[PDB]
């Protein structure tokens, strides 16, 4: 693994140092339907005219980005996504900007958000959750080795591909940092205590988030929930966690080590790093190599009828994508 990660870093650094820019233009695509919206952008299913291929276009209104103080974050998002390469990370096919917006064109992951399946089914059995968890563990090992912190793990940001495997999207809060950082960002239910406490944090927050994800996948609800974020933060800081009666002893033990407020004790942040997680009893049946190689049979394969099918996604109110005749925030997004 150490051998692999070294080469991976060389590839990443080359792209990090000389990022890809202006690889397409708006009129090369036909916009079809909105696949999802967030606090920042709108992702639409589009069809590339010359190739006939479908893609997922994330559209960010430059003025909204500025308003929400996401300038640096958006630059991080694109610079990082264009430089990464891993089996469970969505691929950025093109990127470009116009007078009004910023565009990130990714491969279209037709299976829908893990979120939709999770809410519909209720919860995932342990082997089912384990399958997904293993992919996240490997992905974080990869990202962290490049000095990258992901910062937004959640079912809404995880897509299921045609083979039932995970595709991580939304690098909105991804950041390349050696040491600690302080930005209060992420999604309420998934924030590690150190983020909420404004004391500074590191990659260990991703491992805490993994704990929240595994818990939510297996339980069907998050370990800390309430009607308002403030109430959620109170619960997270208290640290008290209760487990469903159906949780195996192994799962509970793993979760107590991930949802650990003590940084000197949280799994993934210890001497053995990610190995404390990979070697944990809950993952005993996991063939890490087989997972990386995508040779494991997926516990669930989404239904899909031809290219362009969006049946695995909720419907959203469509909105006109306007483009002024005057360039907005040109200097701010020069490197995009």
């Amino acid at each position: 693994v150490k051998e692999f990660l070294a080469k991976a870093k060389e590839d990443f650094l080359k792209k990090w140092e000389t990022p890809s820019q202006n690889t397409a233009q708006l009129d090369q695509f036909d916009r079809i339907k909105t696949l999802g919206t967030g606090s920042f952008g709108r992702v639409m299913l589009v069809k590339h005219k010359e190739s006939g291929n479908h893609y997922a276009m994330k559209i960010l209104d430059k003025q909204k980005v500025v308003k929400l103080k996401q300038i640096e974050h958006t630059l991080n998002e694109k610079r990082i996504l264009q430089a990464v390469n891993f089996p469970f990370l969505v691929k950025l096919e093109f990127s470009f900007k116009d007078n009004s917006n910023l565009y990130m064109v990714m491969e279209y992951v037709a299976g829908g958000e893990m979120f939709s399946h999770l809410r519909r089914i209720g919860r995932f059995s342990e082997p089912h959750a384990r399958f997904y968890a293993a992919q996240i563990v490997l992905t974080f090992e990869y990202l962290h080795s490049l000095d990258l912190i992901y910062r937004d793990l959640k079912p809404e940001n995880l897509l299921i591909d045609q083979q039932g495997y995970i595709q991580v999207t939304d690098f909105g809060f991804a950041k390349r940092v050696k040491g600690r950082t302080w930005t209060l960002c992420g999604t309420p239910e998934y924030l590690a205590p150190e983020i909420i406490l404004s004391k500074g944090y590191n990659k260990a927050v991703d491992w805490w988030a993994l704990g929240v994800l595994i818990y939510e996948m297996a339980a069907g609800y998050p370990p800390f929930f309430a009607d308002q974020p403030i109430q959620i933060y109170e619960k997270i800081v208290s640290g008290k966690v209760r487990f469903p009666s159906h949780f195996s002893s192994d799962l509970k033990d793993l979760l107590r080590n991930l949802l650990q407020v003590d940084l000197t004790k949280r799994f993934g942040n210890l001497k053995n790093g990610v190995n404390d997680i990979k070697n944990h009893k809950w993952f005993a049946t996991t063939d890490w190599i087989a997972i990386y190689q995508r040779k494991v049979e997926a516990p669930f394969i989404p239904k899909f009828k031809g290219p362009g099918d969006t049946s695995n996604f909720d419907d959203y109110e469509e909105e006109e994508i306007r483009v002024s005749i005057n360039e907005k925030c040109g200097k701010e997004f020069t490197e995009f």
Partner: peptide, 20 residues
């Protein structure tokens, strides 16, 4: 039950990232 309390809560739908 905890499940019932979650289901009756206002945060069972897609959760957006924190924005100041």
């Amino acid at each position: 039950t905890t499940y019932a309390d979650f289901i009756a809560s206002g945060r069972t739908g897609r959760r957006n990232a924190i924005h100041d």
